[PDB]
Amino acid sequence: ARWFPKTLPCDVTLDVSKNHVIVDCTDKHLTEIPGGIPTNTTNLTLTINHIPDISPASFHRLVHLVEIDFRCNCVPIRLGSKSNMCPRRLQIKPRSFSGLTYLKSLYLDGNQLLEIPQGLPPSLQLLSLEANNIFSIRKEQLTELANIEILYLGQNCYYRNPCYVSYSIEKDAFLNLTKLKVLSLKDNNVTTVPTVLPSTLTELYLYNNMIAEIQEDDFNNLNQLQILDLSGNCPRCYNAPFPCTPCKNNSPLQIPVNAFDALTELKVLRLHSNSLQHVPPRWFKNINNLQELDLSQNFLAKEIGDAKFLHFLPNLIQLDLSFNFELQVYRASMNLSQAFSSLKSLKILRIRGYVFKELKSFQLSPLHNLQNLEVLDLGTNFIKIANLSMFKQFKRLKVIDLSVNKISPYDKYARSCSCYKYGQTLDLSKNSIFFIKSSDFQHLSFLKCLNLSGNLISQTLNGSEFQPLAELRYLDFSNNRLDLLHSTAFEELRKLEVLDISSNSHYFQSEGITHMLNFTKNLKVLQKLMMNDNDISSSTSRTMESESLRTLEFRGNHLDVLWRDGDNRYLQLFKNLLKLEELDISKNSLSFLPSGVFDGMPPNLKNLSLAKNGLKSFIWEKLRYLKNLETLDLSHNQLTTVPERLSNCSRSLKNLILKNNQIRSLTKYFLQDAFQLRYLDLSSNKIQMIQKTSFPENVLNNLKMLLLHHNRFLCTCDAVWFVWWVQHTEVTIPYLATDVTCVGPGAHKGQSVISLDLYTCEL
Amino acid sequence: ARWFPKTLPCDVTLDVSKNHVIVDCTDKHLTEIPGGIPTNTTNLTLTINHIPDISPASFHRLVHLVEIDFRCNCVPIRLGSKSNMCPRRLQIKPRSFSGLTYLKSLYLDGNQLLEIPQGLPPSLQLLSLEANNIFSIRKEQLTELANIEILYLGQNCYYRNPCYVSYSIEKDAFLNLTKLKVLSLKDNNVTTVPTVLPSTLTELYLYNNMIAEIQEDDFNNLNQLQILDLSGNCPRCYNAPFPCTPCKNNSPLQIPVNAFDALTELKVLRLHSNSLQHVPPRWFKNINNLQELDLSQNFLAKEIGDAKFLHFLPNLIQLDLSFNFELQVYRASMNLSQAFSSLKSLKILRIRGYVFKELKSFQLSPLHNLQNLEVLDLGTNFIKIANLSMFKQFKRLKVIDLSVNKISPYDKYARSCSCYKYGQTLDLSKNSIFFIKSSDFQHLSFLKCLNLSGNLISQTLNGSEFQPLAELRYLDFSNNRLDLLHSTAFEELRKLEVLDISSNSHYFQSEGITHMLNFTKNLKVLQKLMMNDNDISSSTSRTMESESLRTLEFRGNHLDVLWRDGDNRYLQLFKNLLKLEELDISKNSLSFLPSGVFDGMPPNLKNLSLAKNGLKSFIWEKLRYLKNLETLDLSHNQLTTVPERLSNCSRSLKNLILKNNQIRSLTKYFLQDAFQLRYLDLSSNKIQMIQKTSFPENVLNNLKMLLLHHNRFLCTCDAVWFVWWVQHTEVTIPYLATDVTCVGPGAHKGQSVISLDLYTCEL
Numbered sequence A, B: 001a002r003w004f005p006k007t008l009p010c011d012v013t014l015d016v017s018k019n020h021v022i023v024d025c026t027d028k029h030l031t032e033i034p035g036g037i038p039t040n041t042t043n044l045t046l047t048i049n050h051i052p053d054i055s056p057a058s059f060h061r062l063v064h065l066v067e068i069d070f071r072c073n074c075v076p077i078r079l080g081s082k083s084n085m086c087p088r089r090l091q092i093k094p095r096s097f098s099g100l101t102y103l104k105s106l107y108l109d110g111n112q113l114l115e116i117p118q119g120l121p122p123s124l125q126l127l128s129l130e131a132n133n134i135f136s137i138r139k140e141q142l143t144e145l146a147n148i149e150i151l152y153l154g155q156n157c158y159y160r161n162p163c164y165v166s167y168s169i170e171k172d173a174f175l176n177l178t179k180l181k182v183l184s185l186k187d188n189n190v191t192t193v194p195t196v197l198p199s200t201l202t203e204l205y206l207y208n209n210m211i212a213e214i215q216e217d218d219f220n221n222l223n224q225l226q227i228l229d230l231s232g233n234c235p236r237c238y239n240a241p242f243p244c245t246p247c248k249n250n251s252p253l254q255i256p257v258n259a260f261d262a263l264t265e266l267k268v269l270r271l272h273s274n275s276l277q278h279v280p281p282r283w284f285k286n287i288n289n290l291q292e293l294d295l296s297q298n299f300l301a302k303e304i305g306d307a308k309f310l311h312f313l314p315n316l317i318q319l320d321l322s323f324n325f326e327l328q329v330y331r332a333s334m335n336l337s338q339a340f341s342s343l344k345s346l347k348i349l350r351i352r353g354y355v356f357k358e359l360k361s362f363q364l365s366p367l368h369n370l371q372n373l374e375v376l377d378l379g380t381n382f383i384k385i386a387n388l389s390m391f392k393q394f395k396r397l398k399v400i401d402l403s404v405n406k407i408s409p410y411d412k413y414a415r416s417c418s419c420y421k422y423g424q425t426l427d428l429s430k431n432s433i434f435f436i437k438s439s440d441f442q443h444l445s446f447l448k449c450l451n452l453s454g455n456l457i458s459q460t461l462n463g464s465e466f467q468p469l470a471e472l473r474y475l476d477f478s479n480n481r482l483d484l485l486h487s488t489a490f491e492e493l494r495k496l497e498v499l500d501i502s503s504n505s506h507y508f509q510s511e512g513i514t515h516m517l518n519f520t521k522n523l524k525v526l527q528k529l530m531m532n533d534n535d536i537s538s539s540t541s542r543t544m545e546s547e548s549l550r551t552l553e554f555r556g557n558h559l560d561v562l563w564r565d566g567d568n569r570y571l572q573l574f575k576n577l578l579k580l581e582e583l584d585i586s587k588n589s590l591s592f593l594p595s596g597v598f599d600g601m602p603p604n605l606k607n608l609s610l611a612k613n614g615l616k617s618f619i620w621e622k623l624r625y626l627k628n629l630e631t632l633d634l635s636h637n638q639l640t641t642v643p644e645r646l647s648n649c650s651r652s653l654k655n656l657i658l659k660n661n662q663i664r665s666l667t668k669y670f671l672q673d674a675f676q677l678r679y680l681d682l683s684s685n686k687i688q689m690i691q692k693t694s695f696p697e698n699v700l701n702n703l704k705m706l707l708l709h710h711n712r713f714l715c716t717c718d719a720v721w722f723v724w725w726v727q728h729t730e731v732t733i734p735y736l737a738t739d740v741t742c743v744g745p746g747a748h749k750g751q752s753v754i755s756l757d758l759y760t761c762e763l
């Protein structure tokens, strides 16, 4: 099979057309760059680790490197897991990167470097220096980066990682980086925008700084700029869960009217959390092509009423206007201006946090003609009165989000080291609807999904509540109180395809009342039924029935009492679900499967899930009754023994998952003749030795994956074939270097199974 | 000390004036009535157990018995813990009670008896037969009870314990029990009221039966009747979490107008859950003195608007009218009749579940002159708009309960086997108040308590919100989101004495923002501060200060980080609370107390609580710094060793609590010279042997209590003095017969320490 046992503890990828060889040691706790790295590599990854420093010998022989990823090898005080200390920062020797003529990108984020490393090659196009302790930028240290294109100098001075002085940037330190395109100076205690900036900028991220004023000659040359993030300078700090220093006298970021003049190619402009009170239309005079405009967390609740500046944004695609309420004001209505009708190309419109009382009909009348409008977000407004029949006018929409309301009948780019596919959606999750009348959902026939999760509705549905929802294809009814007393529940939902009644545990917990679990017979096109976490322990109906159900999730219920000893009533509880192909009876406290349930399983079953149950002994010779099973999932159980011969058990099994089980050693003919299998998982067990007789490469040659890590191989010389095969076969076994370790004997504890070579075995 | 080692495994009580001797074997798993019971006993208790049967030899010699309690020795199928089976029911021999000439009361509940036991003495005045399988009553088996006074025949046929036939009662089976006073026929599948009943009845409990009609000659002779419970016959069954069978055609219990005619001494009348739609004033024509009237769970929402029948109840004290809503009706207002003003003596008025929308001013105008009215319950109504200033008219009240609303800016006698003390209360718990304005609480100066728990208010209080609450003495602010950024929070609450800001964990969890924990300095009369479960891990303020605080509950926070290693900042966090006398720093993840915190404790501290922390080693020689401690509480910790000499440690300790600790044996001079101690608790430990040298009776003679059960005494002959003292001293040691057992050696496993006599020790 192989004569090249490669002990390199990091993965390798080969895309010979891309001419790329990617060797990634991510989260591998190495104390040094290993030897034997191929000279063929292009991308190298050395993130969270314990590497002490760099040296010219680090990348000595590697000329074909285009990418080095050295992120966060000594995390700052508050920015990383403080179970892993470095004794001090990283140190980079002189001429530590010059020998990399083909280098193009380099990530040194989170490494407590105090100044920018020098000697980098001129071919470098990217450079990430975030979460470091560089709080001073001078021209002479940027002399070497005259060809750079991406420069991430963020998170160098802020509350998670402080430096106690404002960012200093000397005059025109960035000017002669003529190829510079992206510059992210976020979270750097910067006090002024660093003029003069290169004219070839396309993205400038100055957000979360202490910039209080903008000068008129500040964005004066950037005419190829497309993104401008000025978010969080002079923030809105009330009730902020993070340390934030507002401006003086509660002032908004002072931007002159003629500041966005030279910006003509501007496409994104984020002014989130600027304590803004007005937004002049003169800002948007020259920016013709603005697409996205963030204006959250300001004091614009009075501007949203006027909002003159929207007549200048005819190409606007997004408009975030969330969280602009005035403290201690609970408005009776939303006051959107008539200037919202000039947003011809608008698609998304989030106005959460406008806190107000009643959503009436004609308050959204400006939006009655935005033909491209799709999302209409109105969560977290504490609305109380809202006639849902007023959305017979927003039919062409795609989401009508009305979550956390009360209706009744910092750094989101911090790279630390559903219903919508079905059509129109009405999200009424987490409102205060305590019962369902059919007349409420009148005029909402077009609805293809309805989320009612979290309303805590206590109701015995008798098949009349959702009558006008004629086209409904998805219904989320989780986290409610459903009384399944009638089998005619959900009967008028004729086109329904998904039904979620999970976490409706209240009445299913009760003992003695009826639970008509055959309510699915009348649902002709239902494809998926989620009813997990319902504590279903009893059922008046002896069977479930549906000629179309294909998925059933039944996890977090009580099937041990339904399948109690001597109780043959609910043995064929699923047998009549004919098209069913994926059962998820997991976390059902099942301590043993009563012999006979497998004869009462649907015929076309394909993907079974028995995870986290408590299975003390799951018989296998009954698998033959499932002549279509492919994805048996028994992870996180308490089995002890494996089948005698997986050939004799199932003739179609291909996805066994015995993760986190209690197995101590497999059989002598385990995978004997069982060719059809294509995936297996014995991770996190107590298995000790695995011989050859049960693992013929006749079978192994086709296994796409196989996991045996975190278990208890005692790696003595009883396992010579184990050694030779595990470090000389090409069966994929992930983490073959770090987590599948050896328990013994003694001096060979903590050994790798790939680092195994017992020479004195046949001496 | 003693020469009478009494091995009786049940407690004894002696009230020589009452001439009572009470021996109670409650929950003692005895398989037979033990021998040696004193002939002096009066009351005997033999509840939940495994007694097989009775016999004339059971109470052979006991003539002075007045009470036998034989409850639930074989619980029904669903009515008891099904970890304890009887093989079959109890059996009572003939003449099993006749020899008890002085017997007066006998409780045979839950014993699966099929008919009433015969031969009982004529002196019997009480008889409890609930949860049995007697579903037939005949006169000849009641011939013997001609002097009984209390007869509890309840729970003999219902859903928890069925019998599959209606209760049969032959004609006049009860008539010639001339002394009968209380008769409870509840939960018996009774179909008709059992005429003819003895004329000396004062309490008739017929509730939770299948009685559909009342006849006019049914309560025809009972003129000394005072309580009449007809609740749950023809129930209101919608969304009922228990199996209930409604009547036919959804009819109310059919009571004729002239049915409560002979009832003249009626004082309580419960008609809860009768599906009633009208309540005629002719029912209440003759019952002049009705005090309490239950009418919950009916269909009276239209009668509450008319409620003519209230003109006939001028002595009514209580009126429950809860849960009378009509399904799928959300009323705009509450419609109380003007006939609520005729309830001159009314005190309590619960109208929960009237589900309606807005509580306006003049809707409670009938109640504006009920001078004795104290409680006014309006929870669970889903009210949305309610000006709290309209309660400047209900000042004379005592509770104004407005919980689970949405305001913004079966068998409750099933005997199975706060703010109000402070004055006026406004309960606004679990409403939808998301911020506090001072103008909301205007006109509520009279309020002596305010519950705002569960409103999830996110607010930075700067000392102006509760301005009109001038007299407030209690404030519950638990389960909210409090931002302790200012020390002037709660500053205008001048008379405040209790403050609950527990479970306000949101902003205290955040790291980096200020937490002014010295906000208590400005609170001059504050006596108690509860701030548990706040996850307080940091504090901008180095101390807490109050010249009046006497209780402080600080449990479920993070003091391990406040008292971190080398961090001497928050060592004196409490030292300035001068009058403090009870600290509750428990469940604070404290793994060790940094030496020096005891020097920073308040001087007058009296009752300290370090339970469920994680203490690995709690030093004792530092207790001397607390020269007023009396109630050290170290339960549920992980200590190992006890102090060398509790005399040298504290000179005022009297309530040590080391429950559930990890102790393996005390010292040789543990309580040496430590006379002042009066209570001790070493239950649930791993202690093995306790010698005499450390336990002198010079000290033991005064100990009011001492607990050492559920620990690991290996009861070999190394402990001769342990044996003699533990079964020959009169130091109280509870459960000295059942749970303080012996681990060895071998044949002496599971032994009692009172059943210990190793004769061959000094042979």
Ligand SMILES: CCOc1nc(C)c2nc(-c3cncc(F)c3)n(Cc3ccc(CN4C[C@@H]5C[C@H]4CN5C)cc3)c2n1
Pocket: A238, A239, A240, A297, A323, A325, A326, A327, A328, A329, A330, A352, A353, A354, A355, A380, A381, B434, B435, B436, B458, B459, B460
């Ligand atoms: C004196 C106080 O007067 C007052 N007045 C009015 C009208 C309020 N409305 C709310 C409210 C509550 N929850 C959701 C809401 F949208 C609003 N609060 C409380 C509040 C205020 C600010 C933040 C700050 N958060 C960080 C942000 C922005 C916001 C949510 N994002 C995470 C959280 C909570 C209000 N407080």
Ligand SMILES: CCOc1nc(C)c2nc(-c3cncc(F)c3)n(Cc3ccc(CN4C[C@@H]5C[C@H]4CN5C)cc3)c2n1
Pocket: A434, A435, A436, A458, A459, A460, B238, B239, B240, B297, B323, B325, B326, B327, B328, B329, B330, B352, B353, B354, B355, B380, B381
């Ligand atoms: C087609 C349904 O139409 C409808 N119409 C209206 C106006 C309702 N109001 C509520 C409601 C919800 N929660 C609290 C409430 F006071 C009312 N429900 C739901 C409901 C109804 C009955 C019960 C039965 N419970 C046993 C009892 C009595 C009640 C509480 N006690 C434990 C629980 C829940 C409503 N359902």
